[PDB]
Amino acid sequence: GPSFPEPKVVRSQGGLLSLKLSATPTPLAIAGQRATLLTYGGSFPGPTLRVRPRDTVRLTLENRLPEPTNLHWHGLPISPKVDDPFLEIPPGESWTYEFTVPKELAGTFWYHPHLHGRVAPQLFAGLLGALVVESSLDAIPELREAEEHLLVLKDLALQGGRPAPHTPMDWMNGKEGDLVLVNGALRPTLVAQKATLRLRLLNASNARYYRLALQDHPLYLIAADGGFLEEPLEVSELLLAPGERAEVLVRLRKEGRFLLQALPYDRGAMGMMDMGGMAHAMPQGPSRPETLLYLIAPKNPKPLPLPKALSPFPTLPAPVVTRRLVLTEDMMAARFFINGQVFDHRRVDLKGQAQTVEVWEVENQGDMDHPFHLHVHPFQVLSVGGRPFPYRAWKDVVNLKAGEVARLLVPLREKGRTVFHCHIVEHEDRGMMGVLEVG
């Protein structure tokens, strides 16, 4: 096939994407070995769904797993009566998700399970896929002429031909695997045919971070989790925490082979040591560097000019309330808290008013990085760690290093009961989740 593997794309037809998708244990060949994963649509990753604004999506999920499951339409500002974090599809049963894609939307989104207590093993086993909302901005020449690819960043560990089980330490840290894959392939080669690449990036890992850097090149950020920036932003590297997305332009500068790497990054994962005293927790330190893919430039590359503008970001109404949510950890118990509490599906933690704007101050008082995710209501990151954010764009995951405060501007959109949680999904399963009701 193509030198660069990418998930099969399913496109809406005549404004309708109608698709049956099974969640099933699936034999397959992955990274040169046979393994049985849990997949959507028989593939790892699941198929990429490509839609336009105002399309209707009608997705029937058939659960052929031995445990209940559901879908989270991660990043989509749709109703929590559709993107229902409390829904349970029992084994053997089916459920149809039907929604309209919002008119003012563009970017890379994704779908994965969100059944509390079971997310980490199901996501780690292979249950995820991308959703792309294509926009009229994709027709400006500087983007239309670029060579576009999706890069699903997800790691894996195998044991006896199956996803490796979760250990107690995995529940504390979030599980990372030794197979660091792109679109389910081990260090694939991308033989570029054009000098400008447009790369949609998705961190679909349980817990692994990707400190992205392309050898000898900057990256030009053009979209965050949930929409375009206002103009391209040059970066030397780009950290993608679990659940985050980005879109970048790569302007290949000369012929040759360039490594795209996940540079060493210390997210605060912990190990245990015994040095004659008692057993003590000790930092794992930075991750070892990983090569994600080999990028081969074309002959005599002459990249397009960057676009001068992308999408203006909405001027939001003045906020009507400021909220403070404090993240803490009990590492040895693998328990994780928001404002001193663990998730309870019966308890409403925040009550807000639809079509008002709130300021959310999220403070990480733990020692690990925590990627904070809010369902249903995309937000504008104002600042993190006391540093103003260098661009305006819709995000739905914000990474907090130890001690940092993020200030978010949160317009409340669809009414209903939804959740916010750490997207180290082990931490969510172990209680770092709360309930927001919008009325």
Using the contact rule CB under 5 A, the part of the chain among 38-46, 66-74, 152-160, 213-221 near Cu ion is 66-74
Q: What are phi and psi of 188, to 5 degrees?
A: -70, 165
Q: Which of 133, 1, 136, 115 is nearest to 66 (CA)?
A: 115
Count of beta carbons in the 10 Å neighbourhood of residue 145: 13
Residue closer to Cu ion by CB (options 37, 422) is 422
Residue 243 C-beta: closest distance to Cu ion, Å: 5
3-state secondary structure 162-175: EECCCCHHHHHHCC
**Per-residue interface string for the shown chain with Cu ion, residues 121-160, x marking contact by CB under 5 A:** ----------------------------------------
| Beta-carbon-side half-sphere exposure of residue 227 (alpha carbons within 13 Å) | 25
Coil, helix or strand for 322?
strand
DSSP annotation string for 370-389? EEEEESS--EEEEEETTEEP
Q: Is the peptide bond before 232 cis (omega within 30 degrees of 0)?
A: no
Residue 192 C-beta: closest distance to Cu ion, Å: 30
**Residue 350 found at the interface with Cu ion (CB under 5 A):** no
Residue 154 C-beta: closest distance to Cu ion, Å: 12
Exposed / middle / buried, residue 174 (Cβ in 10 Å: 0-12, 13-18, 19+): buried
Residue closer to Cu ion by CB (options 7, 243) is 243
**Residue 424 found at the interface with Cu ion (CB under 5 A):** yes
Using the contact rule CB under 5 A, the part of the chain among 4-12, 17-25, 107-115, 277-285 near Cu ion is 107-115
Q: Enumerate the known binding-site residues for Cu(2+).
A: 72, 74, 112, 114, 280, 370, 373, 375, 421-423, 427
Residue 75 C-beta: closest distance to Cu ion, Å: 8
Residues near 158 by Cβ (< 8 Å), separated by ≥ 6?
30, 33, 35, 164, 177, 179
**Per-residue interface string for the shown chain with Cu ion, residues 237-276, x marking contact by CB under 5 A:** ------x---------------------------------
Residue 358 C-beta: closest distance to Cu ion, Å: 19
Using the contact rule CB under 5 A, the part of the chain among 108-116, 176-184, 255-263, 380-388 near Cu ion is 108-116
Residue 79 C-beta: closest distance to Cu ion, Å: 15
Distance CA 310, CA 325 (A): 33
Residue 433 C-beta: closest distance to Cu ion, Å: 8
Residue closer to Cu ion by CB (options 36, 328) is 328
Q: Are 174 and 242 a contacting pair, CB within 8 Å?
A: yes
Residue closer to Cu ion by CB (options 238, 422) is 422
Count of beta carbons in the 10 Å neighbourhood of residue 161: 11
The arrangement of strands across the sheet holding 129-133 comes to 9-11, 48-51, 129-133, 107-112, 72-74
**Residue 376 found at the interface with Cu ion (CB under 5 A):** no
**Residue 427 found at the interface with Cu ion (CB under 5 A):** yes
Residue closer to Cu ion by CB (options 212, 432) is 432
Alpha helices (runs of H) in 312-374, residue ranges in sequence order: none
Using the contact rule CB under 5 A, the part of the chain among 93-101, 113-121, 136-144, 198-206 near Cu ion is 113-121
Give the residue, chosen from 149, 198, 245, 370, that forms a contact with Cu ion under the rule CB under 5 A. Answer: 370
Using the contact rule CB under 5 A, the part of the chain among 65-73, 186-194, 271-279, 384-392 near Cu ion is 65-73
In this structure, what token pair is assigned to residue 318? 């003045």
What's the count of helices (H) and strands (E) in the chain, helices before strands? 4, 37
Q: Enumerate the known binding-site residues.
A: 72, 74, 112, 114, 280, 370, 373, 375, 421-423, 427
End-to-end CA distance of the chain: 50
Residue 130 pairs in a beta bridge with 110
Residue closer to Cu ion by CB (options 26, 364) is 364
Q: Mark residue 31 as left, alpha or beta (left: phi above 0; alpha: psi -120 to 50; beta: remaining).
A: left
**Residue 422 found at the interface with Cu ion (CB under 5 A):** yes
Residue 277 C-beta: closest distance to Cu ion, Å: 28
Site size toward Cu ion (CB under 5 A) is: 8
Residue closer to Cu ion by CB (options 74, 198) is 74
Residue 164 C-beta: closest distance to Cu ion, Å: 20
Residue 146 C-beta: closest distance to Cu ion, Å: 27
Residue closer to Cu ion by CB (options 142, 349) is 349
Q: Which of 20, 27, 65, 66 is nearest to 44 (CA)?
A: 27
Residue closer to Cu ion by CB (options 219, 424) is 424
Q: Return the ∠ at Cα 423 (arms to 266 and 174), rounded to 5°.
A: 55
Residue closer to Cu ion by CB (options 258, 372) is 372
Rule CB under 5 A: which residues touch Cu ion? 72, 74, 114, 243, 370, 422, 424, 427
